[PDB]
Design a protein around this ligand. Structure first.
Ligand SMILES: O=C(O)C1=CC(=S)C=C[C@H]1C(=O)O
Ligand code: SF4
Ligand SMILES: [Cl-]
Length: 301
């Protein structure tokens, strides 16, 4: 199609779709979305909608999070293979193993986890609320996955013991070189460096701020600095530049989530033409995964 944007806007209105896009989507998809945000922002937005049809642009665990909290809505995705390789390395078998060895340690699962894994969790957390969630739990020991870096960050801030699963659990996208910060400090002496808690400890410790994408987009609301250096996936640069056109946003390095970039204008148009591919979870998976999500809301309420 020669005008994919205009046909997408035409079909979404005609067929009663709200388009939700994650911060890491390509700019062209962010720009056609009704809302752009982090996984829990989009799931909460979906809960407020009068509309019953959602075109979700992200990866499977996020689309499923929307479906779990919006079970009667039709949720479609343009690429059914779009997934989180980090989430996928944690298994039910590994959770059961660690529960057995540490039975008094609550299982805290990062939202970047499979819906099957969520059915086995005591509580879910986001990168924004993980410290507060783990601080508020009774236990001085927790089981945490699937990101070892976020787990270690949480242990640093809370002073609690955090038992990370799986072994070497990590996001390839956030493995920046610490030397990249050394290089921007010299190139932009007055720039503020913001990096994700999924970054390795040497990167986190050299940044001015550590936070989630949702936290990153609030830092220019209180920090009047002209230049920010951003240590997360490249999609956030577009999001920040749109929100704060008066500031400069510099990627710490080019970091692309290949799965996030599986969604294109062409397969997004195909999704609205065919109203596929529907996100379907067994009723029992929705019911079980909902328990640790409600527990998270209870702790943050
Ligand atoms: O939506 C989310 O919560 C995220 C998702 C992913 S895939 C990476 C980072 C974040 C984050 O917001 O920091
Ligand atoms: S950026 Fe990292 S945590 Fe997020 S979907 Fe991609 S591989 Fe998973
Ligand atoms: Cl619903």
């Amino acid at each position: 199609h020669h005008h994919m944007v205009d046909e997408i806007l035409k079909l979404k209105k005609e067929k009663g779709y709200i388009i939700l896009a994650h911060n890491f989507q390509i700019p062209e998809l962010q720009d056609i979305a009704d809302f752009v945000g982090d996984s829990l922002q989009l799931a909460r937005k979906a809960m407020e909608l009068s509309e019953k049809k959602i075109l979700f642009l992200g990866v499977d665990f996020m689309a499923e999070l929307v479906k779990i909290l919006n079970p009667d809505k039709k949720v479609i995705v343009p690429d059914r293979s779009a997934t989180c390789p980090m989430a996928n390395r944690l298994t039910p078998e590994i959770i059961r193993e660690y529960r057995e060895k540490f039975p008094d340690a609550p299982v805290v699962l990062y939202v970047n986890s499979t819906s099957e894994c969520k059915t086995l969790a005591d509580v879910i957390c986001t990168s924004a609320n993980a410290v507060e969630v783990v601080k508020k739990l009774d236990s001085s020991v927790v089981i945490f996955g699937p990101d070892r870096n976020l787990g270690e960050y949480v242990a640093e801030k809370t002073g609690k013991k955090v038992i990370t699963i799986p072994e070497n659990g990590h996001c390839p996208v956030h493995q920046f070189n610490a030397e990249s910060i050394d290089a921007v400090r010299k190139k932009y002496p007055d720039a503020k460096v913001i990096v994700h808690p999924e970054c390795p400890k040497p990167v986190r410790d050299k940044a001015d701020y550590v936070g989630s994408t949702g936290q990153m987009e609030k830092i220019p609301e209180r920090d009047p600095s002209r230049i920010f250096v951003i240590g997360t996936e490249i999609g956030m640069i577009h999001k920040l530049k749109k929100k704060f056109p008066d500031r400069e946003f510099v990627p710490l390095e080019m970091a692309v989530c290949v799965n996030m970039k599986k969604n294109t204008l062409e397969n997004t148009l195909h999704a609205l033409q065919t109203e596929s591919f529907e996100v379907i979870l067994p009723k029992e998976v929705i019911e079980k995964a909902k328990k640790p999500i409600l527990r998270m809301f209870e702790l943050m309420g």
